[PDB]
Design a protein around this ligand. Structure first.
Ligand SMILES: *[C@@H]1O[C@H](CO)[C@@H](O)[C@H](O)[C@H]1NC(C)=O
Ligand SMILES: *[C@@H]1O[C@H](CO)[C@@H](O)[C@H](O)[C@H]1NC(C)=O
Ligand SMILES: *[C@@H]1O[C@H](CO)[C@@H](O)[C@H](O)[C@H]1NC(C)=O
Ligand SMILES: *[C@@H]1O[C@H](CO)[C@@H](O)[C@H](O)[C@H]1NC(C)=O
Lengths: 128, 124
């Protein structure tokens, strides 16, 4: 209505973001975003990573993003079907079966996909 | 001027997109999420019937937003709720690695790896 993003979402440049208040494994986080007619967070570059991190106050909290390990292809792939195409995220940890990517205020971590953490959904105001 | 994005079909209070390509169920969910949309949710027999009327080819199956949860041993929607109903009259087995699809006439359990078309929705 009034603002570009709906109630409870936060605008950050060309995206509306929803930071969850509950926890889920990665696959349930994806389901949640879909239910809310949104995507798990896709991070275009380092600059976007840093601006998103600058919204987070609590330095200890992890959030799933829309990237996980494809075992058959042995690399990180976004839910839009693309391979990770740069090192802008400086992922910390192992690239192995049943791993998924999370972010905190300061870092980006590989975590087992069964781990129960918060998640970030996006709606694009100006898609590519 | 109409209620839905270009290529989406209005049905009652939803906009639906019927894929033309195929995918296993997990990729289908990822596709809908990428399109800022949900895999199809069906509330009851009347919404099933009306959606099925949009499918004009008898062979073709379409994934919806319903699969078999292994931990819970029951059918669960992607919105978190259990099916907890027999309205859809599911044909086939309720077992690990099974997902739900729809045809023009029926509702089928299929292996989640099966590559078929899928239906995404946006609520009006
Ligand atoms: C998928 O998202 C990633 C991260 O934003 C981006 O690098 C990539 O180009 C996108 N792929 C497509 C097909 O849009
Ligand atoms: C990785 O994400 C893709 C969707 O892009 C999906 O095919 C699969 O469920 C995910 N794998 C795991 C182990 O979470
Ligand atoms: C999940 O969607 C299904 C099918 O439309 C419906 O039965 C159920 O009420 C939904 N759950 C919630 C909380 O809306
Ligand atoms: C079933 O869907 C749920 C999301 O609601 C997800 O936890 C899981 O990835 C799916 N399982 C299979 C085998 O596709």
């Amino acid at each position: 209505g009034l603002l570009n993003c709906p109630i409870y979402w936060q605008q950050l440049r060309e995206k509306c973001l929803l930071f969850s208040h509950t926890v889920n494994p990665w696959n349930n986080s994806l389901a949640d975003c879909s239910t809310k007619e949104s995507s798990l967070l896709l991070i275009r570059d380092k600059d976007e990573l840093i601006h998103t991190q600058n919204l987070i106050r609590d330095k200890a909290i992890l959030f799933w993003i829309g990237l996980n390990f494809s075992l058959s292809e042995k690399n990180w792939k976004w839910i839009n079907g693309s391979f990770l195409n740069s090192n802008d995220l400086e992922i910390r940890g192992d690239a192995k079966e049943n791993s998924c990517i999370s972010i905190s205020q300061t870092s980006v971590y590989s975590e087992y996909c069964s781990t129960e953490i918060r998640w970030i959904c996006q709606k694009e105001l100006t898609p590519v």
